[PDB]
Design a protein around this ligand. Structure first.
Ligand SMILES: *[C@@H]1O[C@H](CO)[C@@H](O[C@@H]2O[C@H](CO)[C@@H](O[C@@H]3O[C@H](CO[C@H]4O[C@H](CO)[C@@H](O)[C@H](O[C@H]5O[C@H](CO)[C@@H](O)[C@H](O)[C@@H]5O)[C@@H]4O)[C@@H](O)[C@H](O[C@H]4O[C@H](CO)[C@@H](O)[C@H](O)[C@@H]4O[C@H]4O[C@H](CO)[C@@H](O)[C@H](O)[C@@H]4O)[C@@H]3O)[C@H](O)[C@H]2NC(C)=O)[C@H](O)[C@H]1NC(C)=O
Ligand SMILES: *[C@@H]1O[C@H](CO)[C@@H](O[C@@H]2O[C@H](CO)[C@@H](O[C@@H]3O[C@H](CO[C@H]4O[C@H](CO)[C@@H](O)[C@H](O)[C@@H]4O)[C@@H](O)[C@H](O[C@H]4O[C@H](CO)[C@@H](O)[C@H](O)[C@@H]4O)[C@@H]3O)[C@H](O)[C@H]2NC(C)=O)[C@H](O)[C@H]1NC(C)=O
Ligand SMILES: *[C@@H]1O[C@H](CO)[C@@H](O[C@@H]2O[C@H](CO)[C@@H](O[C@@H]3O[C@H](CO)[C@@H](O)[C@H](O)[C@@H]3O)[C@H](O)[C@H]2NC(C)=O)[C@H](O)[C@H]1NC(C)=O
Ligand SMILES: *[C@@H]1O[C@H](CO)[C@@H](O[C@@H]2O[C@H](CO)[C@@H](O[C@@H]3O[C@H](CO)[C@@H](O)[C@H](O)[C@@H]3O)[C@H](O)[C@H]2NC(C)=O)[C@H](O)[C@H]1NC(C)=O
Ligand SMILES: *[C@@H]1O[C@H](CO)[C@@H](O[C@@H]2O[C@H](CO)[C@@H](O[C@@H]3O[C@H](CO)[C@@H](O)[C@H](O)[C@@H]3O)[C@H](O)[C@H]2NC(C)=O)[C@H](O)[C@H]1NC(C)=O
Ligand SMILES: *[C@@H]1O[C@H](CO)[C@@H](O[C@@H]2O[C@H](CO)[C@@H](O[C@@H]3O[C@H](CO)[C@@H](O)[C@H](O)[C@@H]3O)[C@H](O)[C@H]2NC(C)=O)[C@H](O)[C@H]1NC(C)=O
Ligand SMILES: *[C@@H]1O[C@H](CO)[C@@H](O[C@@H]2O[C@H](CO)[C@@H](O[C@@H]3O[C@H](CO)[C@@H](O)[C@H](O)[C@@H]3O)[C@H](O)[C@H]2NC(C)=O)[C@H](O)[C@H]1NC(C)=O
Ligand SMILES: *[C@@H]1O[C@H](CO)[C@@H](O[C@@H]2O[C@H](CO)[C@@H](O[C@@H]3O[C@H](CO)[C@@H](O)[C@H](O)[C@@H]3O)[C@H](O)[C@H]2NC(C)=O)[C@H](O)[C@H]1NC(C)=O
Ligand SMILES: *[C@@H]1O[C@H](CO)[C@@H](O[C@@H]2O[C@H](CO)[C@@H](O)[C@H](O)[C@H]2NC(C)=O)[C@H](O)[C@H]1NC(C)=O
Ligand SMILES: *[C@@H]1O[C@H](CO)[C@@H](O[C@@H]2O[C@H](CO)[C@@H](O)[C@H](O)[C@H]2NC(C)=O)[C@H](O)[C@H]1NC(C)=O
Ligand SMILES: *[C@@H]1O[C@H](CO)[C@@H](O[C@@H]2O[C@H](CO)[C@@H](O)[C@H](O)[C@H]2NC(C)=O)[C@H](O)[C@H]1NC(C)=O
Ligand SMILES: *[C@@H]1O[C@H](CO)[C@@H](O[C@@H]2O[C@H](CO)[C@@H](O)[C@H](O)[C@H]2NC(C)=O)[C@H](O)[C@H]1NC(C)=O
Ligand SMILES: *[C@@H]1O[C@H](CO)[C@@H](O[C@@H]2O[C@H](CO)[C@@H](O)[C@H](O)[C@H]2NC(C)=O)[C@H](O)[C@H]1NC(C)=O
Ligand SMILES: *[C@@H]1O[C@H](CO)[C@@H](O[C@@H]2O[C@H](CO)[C@@H](O)[C@H](O)[C@H]2NC(C)=O)[C@H](O)[C@H]1NC(C)=O
Ligand SMILES: *[C@@H]1O[C@H](CO)[C@@H](O[C@@H]2O[C@H](CO)[C@@H](O)[C@H](O)[C@H]2NC(C)=O)[C@H](O)[C@H]1NC(C)=O
Ligand SMILES: *[C@@H]1O[C@H](CO)[C@@H](O[C@@H]2O[C@H](CO)[C@@H](O)[C@H](O)[C@H]2NC(C)=O)[C@H](O)[C@H]1NC(C)=O
Ligand SMILES: *[C@@H]1O[C@H](CO)[C@@H](O)[C@H](O)[C@H]1NC(C)=O
Ligand SMILES: *[C@@H]1O[C@H](CO)[C@@H](O)[C@H](O)[C@H]1NC(C)=O
Lengths: 133, 450, 133, 133, 46, 57
């Protein structure tokens, strides 16, 4: 369904689970076009550099959690329940993304580290192992 | 069960600060110091201001803790700056002026209101000097100890005459947000100013915001709907300001009915100064008309709304401001290029119980304006030639309380302020910037662990 | 054959179909190196930012049409003939890229939308389906 | 082993062969945050643009040597021994990356060209061949 | 000083002045740049 | 260097000081253990008004 930019903000997470691209497109705004010092000129350029910098930070994060085939990354290792344990219906029948981030805001830096370290290192050097026969 | 998953494209934001750049339309032509205002370096707006109402959203806003007002205020200062870097620096004016009266109508219905000053001045040649003369509004000349007078901001600031190419006509400015951000607009017709707005929308960037400079009276602003809202973080506090926002554009007609003449004096080399050559035409007094009926009725609507914060058992009084500096005592604003200071006693002069003709406002005209209460800086508007006739809405109000002494029924409110950032908060109250984090972690039956 | 930068401009599209990389390399110019205001300084920086901005716009487009394994993307869904229907020989034996873009210049924004929406959404959530067994 | 940024500099190449990500993270520094001309302002921005420019140059190189699944690219074609022929123990039991680059510094631009041309062109148009049946 | 009569103007010995003065400001170039045109290469960004 | 510069762009330019100074000695301790080390100078100077001047010291 064509919601639009943030169009699924007022929807359960599984609802927004289909409209991901619409936000991604707005990460350059195309034509933007945005002359001496020119107040609003420095602003224009500082804006664009901020935008690409922002974009590249997270694209880097995804490079690290090596998927690049984004919107979905899935492996076969279980998940830790300690971090605000909740039910399936408590998420998909009871929560939208907004309310969800309020609760998950604590464990982010934790999760970043192990998704970074564990799979990258394990999937590493096994390709090195199978590069023999 | 529930297991870990990564998504990209998750429509989630955070409250944040970032920089916002201008977006305008191509109408950049005027005649006082550069351009239109500053806005010709602006990126042209999209011909389709795309919006989208966001169903089901509830986000708390804080029109009193918003940051966009801050960026906006600094940028407007700086744009005024940049318009004032490149034109003539009028330092050699600060000279002893030989002034006499301008004998206005006998006996006095202009009381002069302007003095006739001759003075020495440099020439094209850094040599034998010249004696020129010009007419100055006695509101910007000061004595010493005919009598010798001088410019007011001189012993405190330098002065910088705007040349004749920019305007001061406010042009709709569109604050636009750089990619990766978003602008939230509270779509709720009934909104206090803060707290959770249920009906909201997202836009790529805002509407045209006439950046008018005004005091005590929101001019050309936006209008409220179905009511006349009142906004202030702590009404029960007497140290905030009450932001009233009307439903009905109460007209006001302001004019300067003189045919004034521009006399050019060469402060050579190449720099030229525009003095008031003379005044011809009907020498009335600069003023503003307002339909008494609509003002009274609408201010009664205000009576209702002020009551709703203080009880149907009260009496409210509107008095004029209690004196002080000029820039706060009056409805100061800019209009056709000129700068008007209207005394508003004729508009807050009434106590109100629990339950054409037109009003004339006599305004004075200033020249050496000190903008944004900043000292050490001084723009010098040039005498705008011709007759000035300039019409406008008044959509809001900015009031100050003095009560909570024997606080039962009779409260008295007077107008004032002096910070434009109030003006600015009055149109950005519906707006809030959010940073987008298109990275997301969430559980589904995709699986990874520690 | 080592044509060079745009070296296959005067060639049928199938000819240029082998020299794609040569243009891609020139998208940074390396050493470029391109001090107060310094006319040509603002120019230098505004140039570089324009370059990376340009690069990232299209790289984004390719991110959306999710391939990232560029120069070739192919699926199994038919193609609409309505848009200036022509023959195979009318393209490879009769046309170079230059002449081709003149004719295709109309349908671009159309094509962008469906390549963006259709495959992304279909290939989406099916990975979500096969993440069960 | 958590060495850290460049932490495996004093180690044989096979040792550093596990700590690759740690340098990659430092390619944006996150919070960096790095106002009129403002000496150090121009410096800040010129720095950031230099950083992303640097990043994108090599990411481009990897785009060309089309892997994007970085840290390892391997095919089945032999390798030329002419370029400073050495032993396996002469590398993994005798050399760290530092000493290695000193010796390989000559053949870089050579290697870049064939890794660019050969596999890209060969793996090209074969996908075009198998897009038939 | 000696001035080329092509850049001095009269008034109404006789008193004269610089020509661009009653219209423009003047800005003596100091002695380090040249005016010798040097080959400029307009280069195009990537 | 440049930061020193930028700190010195925006504040007052003291050109009209370079004026003929009327200086005498500052009679420091008799006979001399400061040898003056400072002179007392009065001078003409411009004013707020580009007009009748002032005599400061
Ligand atoms: C709240 O918002 C409202 C709108 O929502 C604002 O209302 C605006 O108020 C300003 C101030 O007066 C109006 O702008 C000025 O109007 C002047 C009056 O001229 C008009 O009437 C005459 C006679 O009926 C008409 O002939 C004019 O029409 C012609 O002129 C205009 C403008 O040139 C053209 O656009 C038309 O196509 C006609 O050709 C007007 O209708 C007018 O003199 C003035 O024009 C000068 O100023 C502008 C900008 O300042 C310059 O770009 C322009 O070139 C003129 O300036 C040069 O020309 C004069 C000629 O004598 C010289 O003397 C100057 O020195 C200079 O060289 C301008 O149009 C405006 O119209 C009005 N809004 C609307 C929608 O009408 C309120 O101001 C605002 N609140 C406050 C507090 O300001
Ligand atoms: C600031 O100044 C401006 C201009 O001076 C004012 O704008 C005027 O506002 C008045 C008030 O409404 C307008 O006057 C009314 O106009 C109506 C519509 O105009 C038609 O009729 C007139 C003839 O009156 C024609 O000339 C015109 O072409 C239109 O066809 C009229 O219907 C009104 O007349 C009715 O009321 C009067 C009572 O006053 C009766 O005598 C009539 O018989 C009739 O019943 C009236 O004329 C005026 O039109 C506006 N100006 C213009 C140019 O249109 C602002 O109001 C003023 N603001 C303030 C705060 O002072
Ligand atoms: C600048 O303008 C002022 C007035 O605006 C002029 O001031 C006048 O200056 C003259 C001297 O040039 C004064 O004359 C003096 O008179 C006294 C007493 O008569 C006499 O003793 C002096 O010897 C001298 O002649 C004159 O009084 C004074 N007038 C006023 C009103 O202050 C001044 O001349 C102008 N300067 C230039 C360069 O145009
Ligand atoms: C908005 O401003 C008003 C003031 O006009 C704030 O009310 C003031 O709150 C303080 C403490 O929060 C009060 O101080 C103490 O209050 C108690 C109980 O009222 C009293 O017994 C003490 O003697 C002492 O005064 C103060 O009285 C009170 N004043 C008024 C006029 O109510 C109010 O808190 C502000 N809004 C918010 C949200 O804080
Ligand atoms: C401000 O005051 C000055 C006086 O200090 C006024 O200047 C003088 O105004 C008179 C008439 O108002 C002009 O009179 C003319 O004088 C000439 C020569 O004497 C005579 O031939 C003419 O028939 C006429 O009488 C006089 O020129 C003028 N002086 C100057 C230097 O301008 C001035 O008018 C006052 N300002 C305004 C706006 O009224
Ligand atoms: C703003 O406008 C108001 C009027 O709208 C001005 O107030 C007026 O001020 C005069 C002089 O102070 C008051 O006159 C008084 O009259 C009594 C009786 O004759 C006399 O005994 C007093 O000594 C005084 O002369 C006048 O009543 C008063 N008007 C009102 C309605 O209060 C005010 O001065 C203006 N202020 C500014 C800054 O424009
Ligand atoms: C707002 O309205 C009030 C009431 O009309 C004005 O206050 C009045 O202002 C006048 C002067 O403008 C005061 O006159 C007094 O005269 C004595 C004796 O000469 C003098 O010594 C005082 O300094 C003062 O000027 C009058 O007392 C005062 N009355 C009240 C009740 O405030 C006020 O001026 C108006 N302001 C504006 C901006 O409209
Ligand atoms: C600036 O300061 C200097 C001293 O610091 C002052 O210099 C004095 O200038 C006056 C003229 O205004 C000189 O008077 C002259 O005296 C000679 C001989 O007595 C006489 O022939 C001249 O006609 C004239 O009256 C005085 O000698 C001189 N003093 C010194 C020590 O140089 C000057 O007056 C000050 N200027 C201002 C505008 O304050
Ligand atoms: C799942 O998460 C819990 C906490 O959220 C982890 O508990 C940690 O255990 C280690 C090892 O004893 C302690 O050093 C930490 O202090 C514990 N965490 C906290 C917050 O106290 C648990 O280890 C995680 N599961 C696994 C398998 O490691
Ligand atoms: C802000 O709006 C609210 C209602 O939308 C006004 O009253 C609130 O009332 C609830 C009770 O239903 C209280 O819990 C809130 O604390 C109140 N809001 C505030 C800000 O205190 C409120 O009056 C409005 N704010 C102002 C300043 O008028
Ligand atoms: C306003 O006046 C009314 C009656 O004069 C007071 O009574 C309220 O009236 C409103 C009707 O608009 C009802 O919705 C309320 O339920 C009534 N409440 C009570 C307690 O009578 C009302 O209190 C007055 N409001 C204020 C703020 O004083
Ligand atoms: C302001 O309100 C007052 C009181 O309602 C009006 O009455 C004037 O009060 C002053 C007080 O001394 C008298 O001097 C005046 O004579 C009164 N007016 C008249 C017409 O007699 C006053 O008219 C109101 N004025 C305005 C401008 O609102
Ligand atoms: C005050 O604001 C009103 C807003 O309604 C302006 O009214 C506009 O008037 C013109 C012509 O009368 C209409 O074409 C517009 O549609 C009106 N606006 C709206 C939103 O309907 C009015 O112009 C403003 N005051 C002044 C003096 O211009
Ligand atoms: C192939 O393209 C044609 C046009 O190029 C498409 O025709 C459209 O059909 C829809 C549905 O009836 C209409 O709303 C459009 O107006 C048609 N296009 C034009 C340009 O008029 C056709 O639908 C496409 N093929 C498929 C399978 O959708
Ligand atoms: C392996 O590398 C050697 C040199 O490092 C290559 O030798 C080149 O052979 C070509 C063809 O005769 C000559 O044109 C070059 O001059 C030789 N190189 C040098 C440095 O002289 C050799 O060709 C490479 N292996 C293969 C299979 O091509
Ligand atoms: C003012 O200070 C100077 C600084 O040395 C004193 O110097 C005099 O210089 C002259 C040269 O012409 C010598 O003849 C004198 O002997 C020096 N004086 C002394 C004390 O050594 C000068 O004396 C000082 N003047 C006064 C009045 O104190
Ligand atoms: C997150 O941490 C804050 C820090 O105090 C805490 O108040 C909050 O309850 C925590 N929420 C969850 C879901 O852990
Ligand atoms: C305004 O109107 C109300 C009634 O509608 C009246 O009581 C009041 O006196 C009016 N205002 C004035 C200044 O007369």
């Amino acid at each position: 369904v064509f919601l639009g930019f943030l169009g699924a903000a007022g929807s359960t997470m599984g609802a927004a689970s289909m409209t991901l691209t619409v936000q991604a497109r707005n990460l350059l705004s195309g034509i933007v076009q945005q002359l001496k010092l020119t107040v609003w000129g420095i602003k224009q350029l500082q804006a664009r550099v901020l935008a690409v910098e922002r974009y590249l930070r997270d694209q880097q994060l995804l490079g690290i959690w090596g998927c690049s085939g984004k919107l979905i990354c899935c492996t076969n290792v279980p998940w830790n329940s300690s971090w605000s344990n909740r039910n399936l219906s408590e998420i998909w029948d009871n929560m939208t993304w907004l309310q969800w981030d309020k609760e998950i805001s604590n464990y982010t830096q934790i999760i970043y580290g192990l998704l970074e370290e564990s799979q990258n290192q394990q999937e590493k050097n096994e390709q090195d192992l199978l590069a023999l026969d | 069960n529930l297991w870990v998953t990564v998504y990209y494209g998750v429509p989630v934001w955070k409250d944040a600060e970032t920089t916002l750049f201008c977006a305008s339309d191509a109408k950049a032509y005027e005649t006082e110091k550069h351009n239109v205002w500053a806005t010709h370096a602006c990126v042209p707006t999209d011909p389709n201001p795309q919006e989208i109402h966001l169903e089901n959203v509830t986000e708390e806003f804080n029109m009193w803790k918003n940051n966009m007002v801050e960026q906006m205020h600094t940028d407007i200062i700086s744009l005024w700056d940049q318009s004032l870097k490149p034109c003539v620096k009028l330092t050699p004016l600060c000279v002893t002026l030989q002034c006499t009266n301008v004998t206005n109508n006998i006996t006095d219905d202009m009381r002069g209101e302007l003095k006739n000053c001759s003075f020495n001045m440099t020439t094209e040649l850094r040599d034998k000097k010249q004696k020129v003369y010009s007419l100055f509004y006695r509101l910007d000349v000061v004595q010493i100890n005919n009598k010798e007078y001088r410019l007011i901001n001189c012993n405190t600031s330098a002065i910088t005459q705007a040349c004749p190419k920019v305007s001061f006509e406010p042009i709709p400015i569109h604050y636009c947000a750089p990619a990766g951000f978003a602008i939230l607009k509270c779509k709720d017709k009934k909104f206090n100013g803060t707290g959770p707005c249920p009906s909201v929308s997202t836009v790529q960037c805002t509407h045209g915001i006439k950046p008018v400079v005004s005091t005590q009276l929101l001019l050309n602003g936006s209008l409220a709907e179905e009511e006349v809202m009142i906004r202030s973080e702590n009404i029960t506090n007497n140290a905030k300001n009450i932001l009233v926002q009307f439903n009905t554009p109460v007209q006001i007609n302001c004019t300067r009915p003189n045919n004034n003449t521009r006399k050019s004096i060469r402060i050579g080399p190449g720099q030229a100064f525009y003095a008031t050559g003379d005044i011809i035409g009907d020498i009335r007094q600069a003023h503003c008309n307002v339909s008494k009926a609509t003002w009274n009725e609408t201010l009664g609507k205000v009576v209702k709304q002020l009551r709703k914060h203080f009880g149907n058992n009260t009496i409210i009084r509107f008095a004029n401001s209690s004196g002080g500096d000029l820039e706060v005592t009056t409805h100061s604003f800019n209009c056709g290029g000129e700068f008007f200071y209207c005394n508003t006693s004729g508009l807050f002069n009434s106590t109100w119980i629990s339950n054409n003709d037109s009003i004339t406002l006599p305004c004075r005209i200033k020249q050496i304006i000190n903008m944004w209460q900043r000292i050490g800086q001084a723009m010098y508007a040039p005498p705008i030639q011709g007759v000035i006739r300039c019409v406008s809405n008044i959509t809001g109000l900015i009031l100050t309380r003095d009560g909570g002494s024997t606080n039962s029924t009779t409260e008295t409110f007077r107008p004032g302020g002096g910070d434009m950032r109030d003006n600015w908060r009055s149109e950005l109250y519906k707006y809030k910037v959010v940073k987008i984090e298109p990275l997301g972690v969430a559980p589904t039956r995709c699986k990874r662990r520690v």
